Paper text:
The CD8 molecule is a type I membrane glycoprotein with two isoforms, CD8α and CD8β, which can form homodimeric (CD8αα) or heterodimeric (CD8αβ) complexes. In this study, CD8α and CD8β orthologues (termed ScCD8α and ScCD8β) were identified in small-spotted catshark (Scyliorhinus canicula).
The structure of recombinant ScCD8α extracellular region was solved at a resolution of 1.35 Å with a space group of C121 and further refined to a Rwork/Rfree factor of 0.198/0.2. The structure is composed of two molecules arranged in the asymmetric unit. Despite low sequence homology with known CD8α molecules, ScCD8αα retains typical IgSF V architecture. Like its counterparts in higher vertebrates, the ScCD8α dimer consists of 2 anti-parallel β sheets containing 10 β strands, labeled as A, A’, B, C, C’, D, E, F, G, G’. Notably, the A strand is in the back β sheet, lying parallel to strand G’, an arrangement seen only in grass carp CD8α thus far. Two cysteines (Cys19 and Cys84) form a disulphide bond linking the front and back sheet of ScCD8α and stabilizing the IgSF V architecture. Five aromatic residues including Phe30 (strand B), Phe40 and Tyr43 (strand C), Tyr83 (strand F) and Phe94 (strand G) are located in the center of ScCD8αα dimer, forming a hydrophobic core with a BSA of 315.51 Å2 and contributing to 58.2% of the total hydrophobic force. The structure of ScCD8αα shows a canonical cavity is formed between the CDR loops of the two monomers. Structure alignment showed that His28ScCD8α is placed approximately 1.2Å away from the surface, which may explain the formation of the cavity.
Numbering used by the authors:
A (entry chain A), B (entry chain A): 5 to 104
The structure:
């Protein structure tokens, strides 16, 4: 089911949402608790600002999360979501792993 | 890993967050796309309002999602989350399933 990625490569993860407002990224890895990664605003600014590991970029209402230097601890199911009208909408989740 | 639940029973799902603002619930089932369930506001009002299947209730900053008449299509990993300061915080996920 999950896609094997070469250790140390750069993985560009697509969000299928029409990103007209801000988009949150999180992942569910092997560890029990999910991890918030980054948020990118409607105008394209990311929080936290640092782009050395997780770089969220937006063009024409399409947001892409680039996970740089993909390692075993980055393996998991990646989710993008938008909060609108007291509800959540999700992109298609994407699953990536480094062989252990 | 997941907890087997008796078909048709009522499952009260705990959210470990200190729920001082509103809490969203969603689940990841066998189907690829996650499903938004319900949101409960800081003051305790749920959207959508209907409580016949998913009833989110709050007391003393603790939110509990009750899944009534638990069936095979309700099996999955249940998440609660809060959106604060351009980021997401998650409760401990909880996993429930009906034997198939």
């Amino acid at each position: 089911q999950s896609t094997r990625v070469e250790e140390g490569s750069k993985v560009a993860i697509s969000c299928s949402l029409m990103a007209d407002e801000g988009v949150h990224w999180f992942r569910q890895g092997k560890k029990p608790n999910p991890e918030f990664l980054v948020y990118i605003s409607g105008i394209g600014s990311q929080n936290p600002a640092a782009k050395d590991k997780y770089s969220a970029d937006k063009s024409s209402q399409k947001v892409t999360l680039t996970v740089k230097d993909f390692r075993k601890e980055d393996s998991g199911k990646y989710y993008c979501l938008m909060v609108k009208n007291r509800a959540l909408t999700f992109g298609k989740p994407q699953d990536y792993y480094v062989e252990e």
